[PDB]
Amino acid sequence: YSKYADGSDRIIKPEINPVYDSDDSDAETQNTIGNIPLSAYDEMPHIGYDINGKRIMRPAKGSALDQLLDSIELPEGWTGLLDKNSGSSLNLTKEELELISKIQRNEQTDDSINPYEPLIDWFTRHEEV
Amino acid sequence: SEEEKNQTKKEKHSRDIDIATVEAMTLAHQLALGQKNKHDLVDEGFNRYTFRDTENLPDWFLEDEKEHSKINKPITKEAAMAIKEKIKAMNARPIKKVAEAKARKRMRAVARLEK
Amino acid sequence: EERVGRRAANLRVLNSYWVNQDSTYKYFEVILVDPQHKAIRRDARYNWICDPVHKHREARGLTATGKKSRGINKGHKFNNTKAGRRKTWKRQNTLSLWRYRK
Amino acid sequence: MNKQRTLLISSRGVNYRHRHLIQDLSGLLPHSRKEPKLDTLQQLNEIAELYNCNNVLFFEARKHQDLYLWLSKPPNGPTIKFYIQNLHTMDELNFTGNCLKGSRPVLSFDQRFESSPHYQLIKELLVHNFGVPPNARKSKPFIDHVMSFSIVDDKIWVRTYEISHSTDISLVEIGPRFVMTVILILEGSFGGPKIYEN
Amino acid sequence: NNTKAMKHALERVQLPWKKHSFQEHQSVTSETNTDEHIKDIYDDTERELAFYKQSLDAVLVARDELKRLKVPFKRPLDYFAEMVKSDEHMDKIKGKLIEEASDKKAREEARRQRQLKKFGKQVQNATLQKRQ
RNA sequence: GUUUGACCUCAAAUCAGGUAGGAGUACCCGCUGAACUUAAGCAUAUCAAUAAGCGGAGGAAAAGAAACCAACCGGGAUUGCCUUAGUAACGGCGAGUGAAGCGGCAAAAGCUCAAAUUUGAAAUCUGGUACCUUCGGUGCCCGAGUUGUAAUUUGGAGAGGG
Secondary structure, three states: OOOOOOEEOOOOOOOOOOOOOOOOOOOOOOOOOOOOOOOOOOOOOOEEEEEOOOOOOOOOOOOHHHHHOOOOOOOOOOOOOOEOOOOOOOOOOOHHHHHHHHOOOOOOOOOOOOOOOOOOOOOOOOOOO | OHHHHOHHHHHHHHOOOOOOHHHHHHEEEEEEEHOHHHHHHHHHHHOOOOOOOOOOOHHHHHHHHOOOOOOOOOEEEOHHHHHHHHOHHHHHOHHHHHHHHHHHHHHHHOOEEEE | OHHHHHHOOOOOOEEEEEEOOOOOEEEEEEEEEEEHHHHHOOOOOOOHHHHHHHHOOOOOOOOHHHHHOOOOOOOOOOOOOOOHHHHHHHHHHOOOOOOOOO | OOOEEEEEEEEEEOHHHHHHHHHHHHHOOEEEEEEEEOOOOHHHHHHHHHHHEEEEEEEOOOOOOOOOOEEEEOOOOOOOOEEEEOOOOOOOOOOOOEEOOOOOEEEEEOOOOOOOHHHHHHHHHHOOOOOOOOOOOEEEEOEEEEEEEEEOOEEEEEEEEEEEEOOOOOEEEEEEEEEEEEEEEEOOOEEEEEEOOO | HHHHHHHHHHHHOOOOOOOOOOOOOOOOOOOOOOOOOOOOOOOHHHHHHHHHHHHHHHHHHHHHHHHHHHHEEEEEEEEOOOOOOOOHHHOOOOOOOHHHHHHHHHHHHHHHHHHHHHHHHHHHHHHHHHOO
8 A cells, every 4th residue: 555665565454453352361360369379368358459459359158058068069060179259169160061071072062063064076076178 | 840850851961061080170170260261172172083973883882982082181280189079978087987097007006016 | 013023023124104093002004024035035126134134123223213213313413323322422431542642 | 542462472593591581571561472482574463463462572583692672563563673682581589579470560761762763763662562551451450660761872771670668669670681772673564674774 | 764754653653642641651751861971881880770760760750640540559468469470489589698698697606706716715714813 | 596606804724835032142233220429418410321131133233325514715425533622512500521513534335115107918926846057947837916016217307209
């Protein structure tokens, strides 16, 4: 479109917009404490601080009955580690648990695809002279 | 009595869902702590072993495939901890077996004064 | 290559290639020449294998993959193993003393 | 209102110390999309186009002692070739002090950066490239360090000082202390005629 | 070295900072400091202090303008978030500092104990005869 | 045709003919692998990619005709000797470890397959068998083999015609 300072033409591309997509090896954090142990905050009424500095309070004061229930019949997506957002145990969604099993028995991860597509002869369609 | 038969469809589902292996546990961590999202695992899901029929095939063939269709993915100690915390049942360490364990170690402490 | 060298001790391991692999086992297809066969002992392109300097080439890593694992090639990168790592170690770790001392 | 992203890339030929510079800058910059390695010039615009990068830090090393940073804006921006002489990394023991990993720095500058439009351009590019956006995803709130930039003997001396509090304020120097000798400025990104020479 | 295209570059690249808040820019320019006033230009002892003075200036100005807005400045000592240098690394530096302090004290007590071995006898007999 | 016949794969036979093991082991090619010691007590390190153990070869073995070195006014397979040189580089930058190109010299040597149709003709080979001028040759027969044996071609190109 336009040119350089000396004799040559340049291609003006539109500006690059820094967007955190569906996958960028990083997600919305909202707890903002890194690879530190959650041994800290076990004596606090909050789990860390976030951007623009305010107190991320611990969400609930559960019963002793429910805590004993979750150490006999463990929750559905129970993972044994502690969440960063809150001191409560990080569970897994039904869809993720389905996805782990479908890796281990190999069972077709990306759906809406055919395992057995007809061989579309993209090259033999046209005969050679 | 319909829910008596409809809830069991979830109760049997969450047995084919729950984590059993260290190899599944690591990937559950890699999800839980933000290292890999859904989109990353859907990429990794396409293996050397994808696009394989399993329902039509005779059992004497699948029982030799499934033994040898395990991709050795890297593990952590962090995952092995939780999977040992998941399998440990109720009667694993009662008062009886604790007292018996001390009854063993007292006998050992006696046997080293027998010399 | 070594296992097929022992089960078929009359033959000589020429080369081997990959055929199929698995979680537990990697498969290969070794290729073997009969040096005692008269169709090999004539024809001057293959009778080099009958020379007794090729008795078990696979046991001494003289095959393609053995020469790879020994690290035998050319250059800066293979200086520690170009004439063989045992040979070069023994050579460079030798106090060489002359009649008229250098 | 300010929304930017940096691409941290390397070349084959980068040694121990220079690898530690890519480590520590990826630490200090919360908007640093850290990338492993590149082998070859024209590709770097396209890498930036994939990750929606507003900036590209290309660390080159021709002879293995040297370092040449190619700071740039990807689509049509003026790229700047440096030669970084002195180096003292993050993991040098004489420096004492913890900055927060990727908190908002405060950019310090000099009088002589406004002397020419030449030094004015590097001043601006150091503001938004070496700086920070107000809402970067890995960025920590409470401000904890600075970025000292100053020119003496035609070269810009870069330091990162953690501010120290007592109960008014001190500041102990840490991090990558290095000079930047402005070698070359291209017209477009890694292409076109050269504007500035030494 | 044409400054024309350089100004054209300043047209495209720049974002209006004066037309917005300080928070979007956050860059206190230490103008009125050329940093050419330094004596011993290749000795880097006065230069360290001069750079320190410049840094401290920009900190104070940024403290004022950021206090003008309703955005906090100080680390509250209530968030224990991830830091640049690791804890084991900080234990290495602190280890080194306590090592050098203990070595300095070792040489101070070295002078002390040597003096005690040299004049210990005279200490005994002087204190005893003074007691008598 | 509910029969007969091609193949494919897998067997057996005191079948015909062969071949492998064990010894020696200085040197040579691999695999496997310590410790005493030395470093200041000492998880690195060092002795040491050593000794012991295990396999495999010959008169030599191995290596070897560049996915080599360089930065020149460019050299040109390997191996060995003098030199590089205690140099470059490694290392609580500690004890210590530690090359290579160049230059000189010893000795020198180059080649061969796979991948492009012999398709106007499997031109190839092993065995059995009868003779002969017998480390073999010739005749006939059973086979191997087109899922490829022969001739041509290997980058220094090369091939088909004139």
